[PDB]
Design a protein around this ligand. Sequence first.
Ligand SMILES: O=C(O)CCCC[C@@H]1SC[C@@H]2NC(=O)N[C@@H]21
Ligand SMILES: O=C(O)CCCC[C@@H]1SC[C@@H]2NC(=O)N[C@@H]21
Lengths: 119, 120
Amino acid sequence: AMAQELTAMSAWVNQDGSTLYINSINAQGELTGSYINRAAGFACQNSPYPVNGWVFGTAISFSTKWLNSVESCNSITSWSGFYINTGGQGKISTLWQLVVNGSSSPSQILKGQDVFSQT
Amino acid sequence: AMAQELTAMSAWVNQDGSTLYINSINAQGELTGSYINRAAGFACQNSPYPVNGWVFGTAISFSTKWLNSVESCNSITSWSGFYINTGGQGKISTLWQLVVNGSSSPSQILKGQDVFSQTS
Ligand SMILES: O=C(O)CCCC[C@@H]1SC[C@@H]2NC(=O)N[C@@H]21
Ligand SMILES: O=C(O)CCCC[C@@H]1SC[C@@H]2NC(=O)N[C@@H]21
């Protein structure tokens, strides 16, 4: 059998239970999808947010604007990462940055690390 | 002379001479544009690369995929940052991350700071 690959129509869950749904990848490599945050310490949980970004081989970037019809967090997250297949599972290993509307210093940009696994 | 703000059809130049062209921002804040890199120590200079991203008030993210018909650098840069009005002059202060096709460790993701200023 086969580990999940980095393709259109693929779903990925990180260590905190948040899910990335990659829905389309166009011929240029532009991606669209949605994201559901389930990580404690952050608001905008349990509802879908829009995603765009890029794929280039095993490299990927994706970014979510935290506004939908139910809750706004006045912020944007961007992830930079790469696909690997280890331990029988496809994964996307990422570093992310979160910027809040109204910031005045780069010290206010929050940073973290997420590893997303297939399924 | 009031500041250029985060609007469609705005151009911005960083401390290395690279230019961000924001071409469109739709009513949801989704952005498209193009980017010309002029930073010493990096390839893929002096040709336009495609950009997408998001605007949210003064917060902005944008990302460039380093492939066009002239040169490929097998990589993607993502910027996160915020707009500031310094008194008639607009700037975007950012932190960036660059990830390369075929990477196997987060230590291989490059990081830096860029500040862009409004330009004609
Ligand atoms: O609180 C906010 O400003 C919006 C929610 C942010 C959730 C962040 S995005 C990076 C990290 N990965 C997640 O799945 N959740 C957090
Ligand atoms: O070398 C590459 O992989 C492609 C070009 C990368 C240029 C980077 S993007 C971040 C920083 N800011 C710039 O204007 N140039 C560099």
